[PDB]
Amino acid sequence: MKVILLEPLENLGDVGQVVDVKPGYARNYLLPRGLAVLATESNLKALEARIRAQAKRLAERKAEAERLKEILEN
RNA sequence: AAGGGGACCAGCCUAAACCGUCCGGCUUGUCCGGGCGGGGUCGUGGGGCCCUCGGACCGAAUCCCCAGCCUAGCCGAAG
Ligand SMILES: [Mg+2]
Ligand SMILES: [Mg+2]
Ligand SMILES: [Mg+2]
Ligand SMILES: [Mg+2]
Ligand SMILES: [Mg+2]
Ligand SMILES: [Mg+2]
Ligand SMILES: [Mg+2]
Ligand SMILES: [Mg+2]
Ligand SMILES: [Mg+2]
Ligand SMILES: [Mg+2]
Ligand SMILES: [Mg+2]
Numbered sequence: 053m054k055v056i057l058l059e060p061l062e063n064l065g066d067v068g069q070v071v072d073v074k075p076g077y078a079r080n081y082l083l084p085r086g087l088a089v090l091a092t093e094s095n096l097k098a099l100e101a102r103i104r105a106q107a108k109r110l111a112e113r114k115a116e117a118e119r120l121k122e123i124l125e126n
Numbered sequence: 127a128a129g130g131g132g133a134c135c136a137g138c139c140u141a142a143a144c145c146g147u148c149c150g151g152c153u154u155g156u157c158c159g160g161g162c163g164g165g166g167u168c169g170u171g172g173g174g175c176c177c178u179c180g181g182a183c184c185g186a187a188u189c190c191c192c193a194g195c196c197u198a199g200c201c202g203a204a205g
Contacts (some may be wrong), residue, residue, distance in 0.1 A: 060154080092157060101157050 053078050054091035056099055061087065068099060 053075045059063050065071045070091055073082065082088040089095055 089153095095153095098153075098155095098158055101155065102153065105155070105157085 055082060055088040056095065057088050057089050059087055068103065070096075070099075 055078050057067055057069050060066050
């Protein structure tokens with residue numbers, strides 16, 4: 053069963069990552085303890101949009117600076 | 127059971143894509159979800175979206191009126 057981790061988890065996987073666990077594990081431990089969520093299409097979308105939105109504001113800072121290399125350094 | 131002969135005869139509405147709107151969530155949006163509206167409905171496959179061209183008739187199973195019908199009656203020949 054595919055779930056998306058909400059946290060780093062000892063020898064399972066890393067936050068945001070999509071892993072495969074026994075339905076029991078997911079339903080009766082992972083999900084109830086907030087540690088993960090079903091890899092539904094609908095919240096697979098969302099994880100993708102977060103990966104997307106983080107990657108925007110990061111490469112957008114690696115540009116706000118690189119541009120400030122141009123004001124100084126000259 | 128098909129098929130043949132008959133009775134009757136009638137076909138429609140959606141879900142999804144996509145577009146819009148309100149509402150809610152927290153893991154802030156190019157987000158996810160729920161309501162509503164638009165769109166769409168099919169087997170020669172149909173639809174959506176994007177180009178090109180083209181730009182009145184049909185019509186209810188709903189509603190309204192009416193004929194007709196029912197719920198009392200009445201006239202009715204000649205010892
Ligand atoms: Mg048979
Ligand atoms: Mg027959
Ligand atoms: Mg027949
Ligand atoms: Mg008959
Ligand atoms: Mg939705
Ligand atoms: Mg929406
Ligand atoms: Mg909606
Ligand atoms: Mg087609
Ligand atoms: Mg109808
Ligand atoms: Mg009499
Ligand atoms: Mg008499």
